[PDB]
């Protein structure tokens, strides 16, 4: 199955974690727990923002202008990215906006962090028509000494 994982700010703005004025180690932990031992697919801007492969995962970069870096797998198409994951139970798509857009129609599950921060981002998370998805897990957290803003985790599964 294909799953997307994203952090959505107020108005569903998404962007690069390093450009955001939040510090959310709890969200980093959630991302790590849900992606470890799985392949992750990202676009070129996300790769360039992270600057290095995410350890403990197979990194696959979907772009039209491929890369210099032998630690990751470069692919040119959605079907190539999927094949690059091979025989696995769950493929994690970790963004870019354009990447989320390309994979959402194929996705069965969404892992979202809803952040109580109004921020400038690259774009918004794609329309996920409420009625195609059911919320199966949901948990709210306040801001604390380690996490600058309050956040809610949610998992949705496709109807």
């Amino acid at each position: 199955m294909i799953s997307l994982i994203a952090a959505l700010a107020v108005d569903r703005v998404i962007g690069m974690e390093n450009a955001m004025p939040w510090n959310l180690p709890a969200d980093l932990a959630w991302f790590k727990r849900n992606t470890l031992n799985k392949p992750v697919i990202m676009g070129r801007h996300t790769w360039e923002s992270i600057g290095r492969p995410l350890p403990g995962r197979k990194n696959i970069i979907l772009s039209s202008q491929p890369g210099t870096d032998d630690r990751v797998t470069w692919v040119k198409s959605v079907d190539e990215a999927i094949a690059a994951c091979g025989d696995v139970p769950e493929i994690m798509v970790i963004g870019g906006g354009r990447v989320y857009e390309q994979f959402l129609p194929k996705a069965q599950k969404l892992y979202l962090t809803h952040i109580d921060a109004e921020v400038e981002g690259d774009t918004h998370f794609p329309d996920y028509e409420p009625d195609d998805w059911e919320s199966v897990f949901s948990e709210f957290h306040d801001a604390d000494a380690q996490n600058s803003h309050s956040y809610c985790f949610e998992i949705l599964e496709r109807r």
Binding site: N18, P21, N23, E118
Partner: protein, 115 residues
């Protein structure tokens, strides 16, 4: 209450430290931010620091060059700026609750970096 100071005219390559005196809230309980407004532009966050002053995060444009710090006993926030460049010219503000509807910042301090 937040009041920034320490702004001025600095030659490129120079250093400057800004200060923000805080009152009227429990300073040591809050994340604090530095943000800036460059001529013609929106506000751009620059730096943030957690209550105890042990977690910091910097915008990519200032990493390796700026240091945010705080003195919870004095209720003051600091921004050390090194290797200043023309592109750092801006009104700098200290802010509480940045990126929320509770966001508040001072009147700001002007930094002009000019050769």
């Amino acid at each position: 209450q937040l009041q920034e100071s320490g702004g001025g005219l600095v030659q490129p390559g120079g250093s400057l430290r800004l200060s923000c005196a805080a009152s009227g809230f429990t300073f040591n309980n809050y994340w604090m931010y530095w943000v800036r407004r460059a001529p013609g532009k929106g506000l751009e966050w620059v730096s943030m620091i957690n209550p105890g002053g042990i977690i910091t995060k910097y915008a990519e444009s200032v990493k390796g060059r700026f240091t945010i710090s705080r003195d919870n006993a004095k209720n003051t926030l600091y921004l050390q700026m090194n290797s200043l460049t023309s592109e750092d010219t801006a009104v700098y503000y200290c802010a509480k609750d940045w990126a929320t509807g509770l966001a508040k910042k001072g009147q700001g301090t002007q930094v002009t970096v000019s050769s």
